Design a protein around this ligand. Structure first.
Ligand SMILES: *[C@@H]1O[C@H](CO)[C@@H](O)[C@H](O)[C@H]1NC(C)=O
Ligand SMILES: *[C@@H]1O[C@H](CO)[C@@H](O)[C@H](O)[C@H]1NC(C)=O
Lengths: 36, 31
């Protein structure tokens, strides 16, 4: 939108990043520091 | 922009093409 200017989308969507943080958060609530 | 997706010439010579943020009805099989 404009003249020669474009914006590229990020590779990870926001859904994917919220998935990543919920996996980190379920790992720590449930296993402590052992999963890292 | 136009981008070309290739598996590498040491694998195949087929190619796919991305027309970036263009509606796919105004480009000029698999679309
Ligand atoms: C590249 O080509 C060589 C010989 O033609 C082959 O040994 C190698 O596996 C090829 N690499 C890939 C990624 O296919
Ligand atoms: C492309 O144009 C058609 C015709 O108006 C429209 O239905 C379609 O939604 C457009 N593409 C996108 C990604 O919206």
């Amino acid at each position: 939108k404009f003249n020669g200017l474009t914006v590229l989308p990020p590779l990870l969507t926001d859904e994917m990043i919220a998935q990543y943080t919920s996996a980190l958060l379920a790992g720590t609530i449930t296993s402590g520091w052992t999963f890292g | 922009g136009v981008s070309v997706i290739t598996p590498g010439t040491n694998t195949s010579n087929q190619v796919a093409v991305l027309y970036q943020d263009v509606n796919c009805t105004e480009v000029p099989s698999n679309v």
